[PDB]
Structure formats: structure tokens, C-alpha cells
Design a binder for this molecule. Structure first.
Ligand SMILES: CCC(=O)N1CCc2[nH]nc(-c3ccccc3)c2C1
Length: 127
């Protein structure tokens, strides 16, 4: 029923890059999803205490959210676009795992995911 530490957003010994694909992930993909009317439940880690979801972190062992992703991108945490793409996919999958089909939260994730897929379809070729 307690919240775990959030995912890491800083690690000085992890090697980093700033690639055109990663810049796209921040400037197009994250920015597009973040501004959406359905973004709000996804803009920070799940607060299992506030939401009274004491089983959330029993079920979800690889938590991810766009606040974390935003921090990672702004802090140049990633080596490659795949890492960041995996984070978005983890976030969506967690939602689908934890919740029931047709719940509001699932409809919200599905809308965000549709947009995500459309933007990733146009991920620029690496420079
Ligand atoms: C991040 C989406 C998720 O799976 N959550 C667990 C189930 C759930 N129900 N309601 C929410 C939620 C709504 C608004 C703000 C934060 C979380 C959530 C968060």
C-alpha cells in the first residue's frame, strides 16, 4: 500500500547522448502527449496512497509515467530512442494490465497511445 521510490531520472555514470531521434521524442512526441486533455493521470508516478490503490505496486513492478519520461528527456538520460520508446510502451502496458477494458483510464491511455503511434511512425532517420 506504500509508494515505491520513483524510477531513476538521473545517473551520472550512465552514458548519454542527445540524438536527433531523441530530440524528436521530446519536441514532438512528449510535447504532443503532454498537452492532450487526457494526459493528466499520466503526468506523474501513480500515487497509490492518494488514489487508495494499495495493490497497484503489487501488480505493477516496472512503473512508468510521462513525468519520469519528461525528466529523462530534459536531463539527457537516454542513449537511444528505443530506450525512450520502451518507457512510453511500459506506461501504456501498465495501464492495460492494471485496469479493466473500457475503464475511463484505459480510454485515456488508448487515445494517448494512438497519437504516440502516429508520431513514432514519423521518427526521423538517424543523422
Ligand atoms: C496511470 C494510470 C493508472 O493505471 N492508474 C491506476 C488506476 C487509476 N485510476 N485512476 C487513476 C488516476 C486518475 C487521475 C489522476 C491520477 C490517477 C489511476 C492511475
Amino acid at each position: 500500500s506504500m509508494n515505491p521510490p520513483p524510477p531513476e531520472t538521473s545517473n551520472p555514470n550512465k552514458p548519454k547522448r542527445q540524438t536527433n531521434q531523441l530530440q524528436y521524442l521530446l519536441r514532438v512526441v512528449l510535447k504532443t502527449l503532454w498537452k492532450h486533455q487526457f494526459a493528466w493521470p499520466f503526468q506523474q508516478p501513480v500515487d497509490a496512497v492518494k488514489l487508495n490503490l494499495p495493490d497497484y505496486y503489487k501488480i505493477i513492478k516496472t512503473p512508468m509515467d510521462m513525468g519520469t519520461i519528461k525528466k529523462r528527456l530534459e536531463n539527457n538520460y537516454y542513449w537511444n530512442a528505443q530506450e525512450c520508446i520502451q518507457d512510453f510502451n511500459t506506461m501504456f502496458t501498465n495501464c492495460y494490465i492494471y485496469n479493466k477494458p473500457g475503464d475511463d483510464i484505459v480510454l485515456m491511455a488508448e487515445a494517448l497511445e494512438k497519437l504516440f503511434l502516429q508520431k513514432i511512425n514519423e521518427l526521423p532517420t538517424e543523422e
